[PDB]
C-alpha cells in the first residue's frame, strides 16, 4: 500500500494548505476586527506583574536547581530570601485574617439571606478529629496549668560510595534475563527489519531492548527511538525506570509524551508515548523521518489503536526500505503476527518463573462468591507466607464480597489474625488504590480482591495464592440491532494463563481454578476476541477517512472488522454532516476530525454558533468525554451521597446537571474538598477539566468563538439535539430500531417519565438501559437532519 | 498500625468507653452536640419518665455489665437441677433442659391485662 501512503502524504499537504487558508482567514478577521498618570498606571501594572512573575518563577528555579561552595552560598541566599518573602506575605495575610476575625453583629437584611465566605481538612481527618473529641471528653486534669514549681527533679545517677551505587545499578541491569540474549537480539535486529519478539513478562524486555538499541547507536543523526505503550501509567512507569537506570531527568534524552503531559524538551532520544500519540503524528507527519526505530508494545492487549498502528506499520514496511521496527509479545501466539508481517522472524526470550501449579474443583458450580470466600478462609488457615488475590468481574458483587469477608473476619477475634481486605475498581478514588501499594504488616496475610486491573494493568508484589472464577465482562456491540451489551462471559485460556503469570510473580504460585479442568481443557476458549469485533468503530472510521484511506472495507488488518459495523458507521457519517454523496469527507468533516473526541459528540461543536452557547455544551462534552463514572456511591452512607446527587438536579436531563457540577466547581477554587463534600470523584472530573482545556485550545483550528448565552438552556438542549438526532427513543421503545427501553435508576429522570427524550448510550446489563437522558419536545427535532426524520 | 491485641485488654474500660471509638455510626455521631440537655428537656416532651436520663449508650458507652449476675444467681439458687426440681419440667417429659426455648385490626379493648403469660407462669 505505497500509493495509500502517497495519497496520505498528499492529503497532509492539502490539509496544510487548508490550514494556511483558514489561518489567512483568521488574520483577515483579526484585521477586520495625564502623561505622569499614565506613567504611574504603567509602572503599577509593570511592577505588579513583574513581582508576581518573579515570585512565581523563583521557587520553580530553586526546584529545578534541586532536581539538577559559591553555588551553595547562592542557593542558601535564594532559599533565605524566598523564605523572607513568604513570611512577609504571610504577615500581610495574617493581618487580613485578624481583621476578618471580629464580632461584627449582623445587619438586619431585607429579603432572602445570601451565603457569605465560609473550612478545614475534610478528607479523612474526621476520624482523628472525633478521636480528639473523645480524648478531650476523656482527659481529666485538675489545678492550674502552671504546676512545674516546687519540683526537686531528681536525676538518675547511672554509671561511670556513590560509584558503588551506580555499579550496583549496572549489576541489577545485568541481572536481567535478556542480558545473555542481547547479542543474538541485536544480530537479529541487523538481520531483519520486521523482527517479532516474544517472551513472558518479568524478563525486562521493554526497558532493556530500547536501552540496548541506545548503546547500539541507532540515534546518531538525530532520528530518535520511539516506544509505544497501551496505557499512559505503564508508559510513566517504564520511562521512570529507564530514567532512573540512566540517572537522567525526564524531558531530556529519556522523555515522554502522553495526553496532557509532554515532557520532551527537544533533546529526547528515548521517546515514550501511547498509540494515540503515534496515530496523531501519523495524522501530522506522513513518514517518520524523525524516528529511526519504532518499538511496538505487546499485542496481547489487542487494543484497537494498536491494530490500526499494525496496519500503518505494515504500510511503512511496504514503503520505507528500512525502519527496524519490532513488536513485543507475551505468549507463544506469534505465528499470526509473523504471517501478517510477511513471514516475520520470531525471537523468544525466557523469563523468570515459578511453579504456579493450577488446582481444581471436582464439581461444576455457578455461584463463585460464597465458595471464593470459603476458599479465602481455607487459604488463611493453611501456609502463612503469601498474599491473596481474588478475581471478580464487577463493582456490585465485589463490594458484597468485601462486606461478606469483613463480616466473617469480624466474627472471629483473637482466632484468625488480621486479613485486611482491599478492593480494586476503575471508579475508585486514588487513596484506596494507593493503599494497595503499601507494604503488608508483618502479622498480616493481606488480601487484595480485584477485577482485571491486576490482570492487565497493575502489578502488585507479594501475591502467592490466586483465585479465578473465569468470568469477565465484555462490551459486545450488535450493529444489527444498534445495541451494545456489557455482559459477563467465561474467559479465555490465554487470560487464565496471564492470570497465572500474575499469580507467581515473586514466589511459587498456588493459582486455584474455580471450575473443572475438563471445561478448562475443552469448553474454555483459547483465544480472546479483540476490540474491533466487540465494539462499534464510529470514532475511528472518521480517523481512517481523515488519513486518506478510502478502502475501509479492504484495509489491511490482523482480522477484518464486520461489514455491518462499517455499514452503520458510514450510515451515521452520512446522517452526520461529514460525508458527501460519494462518501467523501467534506471540510466540515475535516472540522469533525480535527478535535479527537467521538463525532457523535463532536457535532456539539458544529452545532455551536448555530445556537450560540458554545462554552456550555463544551463543558457538557467535557463531562461526556470522561472514562470513569461521575459521582461517588459508596458502600453504606447512600443517603448523603444521594442527597448530594439530588442537590445538583436541574430540569432537562442530566447534561444540565453535569454543566451545573462544572459551574459550581468553578468559583470554588477547583478544590478537592468541594468534590469530597459533594461526593464527586477528584480523579475523573480533573480529566474533564483537562479535556475542556484541550478542547478550548483546539477552537481556532475549527474557528469557533467562545460563545455563551447565560440562561438559554433551551438553546443548549437545541444544540445538543442538533448534535444528537440519531440517539432518540420514545414510547418505551426505540423510534427507529423498535427495541424496548427502560430508564436507569441512577438517571436524574428515573421518575417523572418524559414526553420526548434523547440519550447518549444504550448499555444492556440486566434491562435495556437509558444512560444520560435529556428532555426534548420533538419540535426542533425536525429542524435538524430532515433526511433522517419524517412522519413524527 | 494499632492491632486488636493492643486494645483487647482495655476494650471495655474508660468512662468514654474505648470501644466507642470504633462504632459503625461514629461519623454521623460526631455532629451530635448537646444531648444531655436534650434528655433533660425531653422530660418535658415525652410522657414517660426516663431513669437513664444522664447517659447514652452510643456516646458514653455501656457503663455496666451484669452477665455474671445471672450465672451466680443460677449457682446460688442451687444449680439448674435444683431450680428445675421446683418446676413442671419433669411433667413435660423432655430429655434435657439444654434444648429448651420459650416464646391492623379493630378491637373493643386492648388495655386489659393479658392473662396468658401469667397463666403459663403459674
Amino acid at each position: 500500500e505505497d500509493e495509500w501512503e502517497r495519497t496520505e502524504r498528499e492529503r497532509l499537504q492539502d490539509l496544510e494548505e487548508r490550514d494556511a487558508f483558514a489561518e489567512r482567514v483568521r488574520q483577515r478577521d483579526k484585521d477586520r476586527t495625564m502623561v505622569p498618570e499614565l506613567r504611574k498606571k504603567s509602572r503599577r501594572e509593570y511592577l505588579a506583574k513583574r513581582e508576581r512573575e518573579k515570585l512565581e518563577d523563583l521557587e520553580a528555579e530553586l526546584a529545578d536547581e534541586e532536581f539538577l561552595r559559591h553555588e551553595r552560598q547562592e542557593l542558601k541566599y535564594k532559599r533565605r530570601v524566598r523564605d523572607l518573602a513568604r513570611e512577609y506575605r504571610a504577615a500581610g495575610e495574617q493581618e487580613k485574617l485578624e481583621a476578618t476575625n471580629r464580632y461584627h453583629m449582623p445587619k438586619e437584611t431585607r429579603g432572602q439571606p445570601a451565603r457569605a465566605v465560609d473550612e478545614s481538612g475534610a478528607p479523612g481527618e474526621e476520624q482523628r478529629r472525633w478521636e480528639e473529641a473523645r480524648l478531650g471528653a476523656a482527659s481529666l486534669k485538675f489545678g492550674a496549668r502552671d504546676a512545674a514549681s516546687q519540683e526537686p527533679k531528681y536525676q538518675l545517677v547511672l554509671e561511670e560510595t556513590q560509584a558503588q551505587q551506580k555499579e550496583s545499578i549496572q549489576a541489577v541491569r545485568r541481572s536481567l534475563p535478556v542480558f545473555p540474549f542481547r547479542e543474538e537480539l541485536l544480530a537479529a535486529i541487523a538481520n531483519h527489519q520486521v523482527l517479532i519478539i516474544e517472551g513472558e513478562t518479568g524478563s525486562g524486555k521493554t526497558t532493556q531492548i530500547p536501552q540496548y538499541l541506545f548503546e547500539e547507536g541507532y540515534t546518531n543523526k538525530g532520528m530518535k527511538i520511539a516506544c509505544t505503550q497501551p496505557r499512559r501509567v505503564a508508559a510513566m512507569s517504564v520511562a521512570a525506570r529507564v530514567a532512573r537506570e540512566m540517572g537522567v531527568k525526564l524531558g531530556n534524552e529519556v522523555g515522554y509524551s502522553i495526553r496532557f503531559e509532554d515532557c520532551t524538551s527537544e533533546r529526547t532520544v528515548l521517546r515514550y508515548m501511547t498509540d494515540g500519540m503515534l496515530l496523531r503524528e501519523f495524522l501530522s507527519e506522513p513518514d517518520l523521518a524523525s524516528y529511526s526505530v519504532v518499538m511496538v508494545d505487546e499485542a496481547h492487549e489487542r487494543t484497537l489503536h494498536t491494530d490500526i498502528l499494525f496496519g500503518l506499520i505494515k504500510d511503512v514496511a511496504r514503503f520505507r526500505p528500512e525502519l527496524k521496527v519490532l513488536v513485543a509479545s507475551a505468549t507463544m501466539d506469534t505465528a499470526r503476527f509473523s504471517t501478517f508481517f510477511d513471514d516475520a522472524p520470531v525471537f523468544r526470550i525466557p523469563g523468570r518463573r515459578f511453579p504456579v501449579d493450577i488446582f481444581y474443583t471436582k464439581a461444576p458450580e455457578a455461584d463463585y462468591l460464597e465458595a471464593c470466600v470459603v476458599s479465602v478462609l481455607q487459604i488463611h488457615v493453611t501456609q502463612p507466607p503469601g498474599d491473596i488475590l481474588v478475581f471478580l468481574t464487577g463493582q456490585e458483587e465485589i463490594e458484597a464480597a468485601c462486606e461478606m469477608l469483613q463480616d466473617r473476619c469480624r466474627r472471629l477475634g483473637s482466632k484468625i489474625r488480621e486479613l485486611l481486605v482491599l478492593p480494586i475498581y476503575a471508579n475508585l478514588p486514588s487513596d484506596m488504590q494507593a493503599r494497595i501499594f503499601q507494604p503488608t504488616p508483618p502479622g498480616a496475610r493481606k488480601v487484595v480482591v480485584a477485577t482485571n486491573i491486576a490482570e492487565t494493568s497493575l502489578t502488585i508484589e507479594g501475591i502467592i495464592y490466586v483465585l479465578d472464577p473465569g468470568f469477565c465482562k465484555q462490551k459486545s456491540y450488535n450493529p444489527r440491532t444498534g445495541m451494545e451489551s456489557l455482559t459477563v462471559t467465561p474467559c479465555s485460556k490465554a487470560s487464565a494463563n496471564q492470570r497465572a503469570g500474575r499469580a507467581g510473580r515473586v514466589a511459587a504460585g498456588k493459582c486455584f481454578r474455580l471450575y473443572t479442568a475438563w471445561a478448562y481443557q475443552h469448553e474454555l476458549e483459547e483465544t480472546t476476541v479483540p476490540e474491533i469485533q466487540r465494539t462499534s468503530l464510529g470514532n475511528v472510521v472518521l480517523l481512517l477517512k481523515s488519513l486518506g484511506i478510502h478502502d475501509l472495507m479492504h484495509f489491511d488488518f490482523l482480522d477484518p472488522p464486520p461489514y455491518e459495523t462499517l455499514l452503520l458507521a458510514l450510515e451515521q457519517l452520512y446522517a452526520l454532516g461529514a460525508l458527501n454523496h460519494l462518501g467523501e469527507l467534506t471540510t466540515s468533516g475535516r472540522k469533525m476530525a480535527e478535535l479527537p473526541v467521538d463525532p457523535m459528540l463532536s457535532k456539539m461543536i458544529l452545532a455551536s454558533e448555530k445556537y450560540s452557547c458554545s462554552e456550555e455544551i463544551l463543558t457538557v462534552a467535557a463531562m461526556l468525554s470522561v472514562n470513569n463514572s461521575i459521582f461517588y456511591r459508596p458502600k453504606d452512607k447512600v443517603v448523603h451521597a444521594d442527597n448530594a446527587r439530588v442537590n445538583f438536579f436541574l430540569p432537562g436531563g442530566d447534561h444540565l446537571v453535569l454543566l451545573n457540577v462544572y459551574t459550581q466547581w468553578a468559583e470554588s477554587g477547583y478544590s478537592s474538598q468541594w468534590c469530597y463534600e459533594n461526593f464527586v470523584q477528584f480523579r475523573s472530573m480533573r480529566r474533564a477539566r483537562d479535556v475542556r482545556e484541550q478542547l478550548e485550545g483546539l477552537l481556532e483550528r475549527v474557528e469557533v468563538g467562545l460563545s455563551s448565552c447565560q440562561g438559554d438552556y433551551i438553546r443548549v438542549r437545541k444544540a445538543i439535539t442538533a448534535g444528537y438526532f440519531y440517539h432518540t427513543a420514545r414510547g418505551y421503545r426505540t423510534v427507529k430500531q423498535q427495541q424496548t427501553v427502560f430508564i436507569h435508576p441512577n438517571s436524574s429522570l428515573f421518575e417523572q417519565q418524559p414526553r420526548w427524550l434523547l440519550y447518549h448510550e444504550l448499555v444492556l446489563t440486566t434491562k435495556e438501559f437509558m444512560r444520560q437522558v435529556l428532555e426534548i419536545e420533538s419540535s426542533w427535532l425536525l429542524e435538524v437532519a430532515p433526511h433522517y426524520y419524517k412522519a413524527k | 498500625r494499632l492491632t486488636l491485641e493492643d486494645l483487647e485488654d482495655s476494650w471495655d474500660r474508660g468512662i468514654p468507653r474505648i470501644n466507642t471509638l470504633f462504632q459503625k455510626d461514629r461519623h454521623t455521631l460526631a455532629y451530635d452536640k448537646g444531648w444531655r440537655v436534650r434528655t433533660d428537656f425531653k422530660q418535658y416532651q415525652v410522657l414517660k419518665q426516663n431513669p437513664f436520663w444522664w447517659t447514652h449508650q452510643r456516646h458514653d458507652g455501656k457503663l455496666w455489665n451484669l452477665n455474671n449476675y445471672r450465672t451466680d444467681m443460677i449457682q446460688a439458687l442451687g444449680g439448674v437441677e435444683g431450680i428445675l426440681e421446683h418446676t413442671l419440667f419433669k411433667g413435660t417429659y423432655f430429655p434435657t433442659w439444654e434444648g429448651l426455648f420459650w416464646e391492623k385490626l379493630t378491637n373493643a379493648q386492648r388495655s386489659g391485662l393479658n392473662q396468658i403469660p401469667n397463666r403459663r407462669f403459674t
Binding site: 483473637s414 | 491485641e5 483487647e8
Partner: peptide, 28 residues
C-alpha cells in the same frame, strides 16, 4: 495470648526501659 502478654509486659510500666531510654539519652 501469652506472646501478646509478654509484649504488653515489655510495653508495661517497666523501669528497665526507662533506664535504657535515659542511658541512651545521656550517652548520646
Amino acid at each position: 495470648d501469652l506472646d501478646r502478654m509478654l509484649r504488653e509486659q515489655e510495653r508495661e510500666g517497666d523501669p528497665m526501659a526507662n533506664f535504657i531510654k535515659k542511658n541512651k539519652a545521656k550517652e548520646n
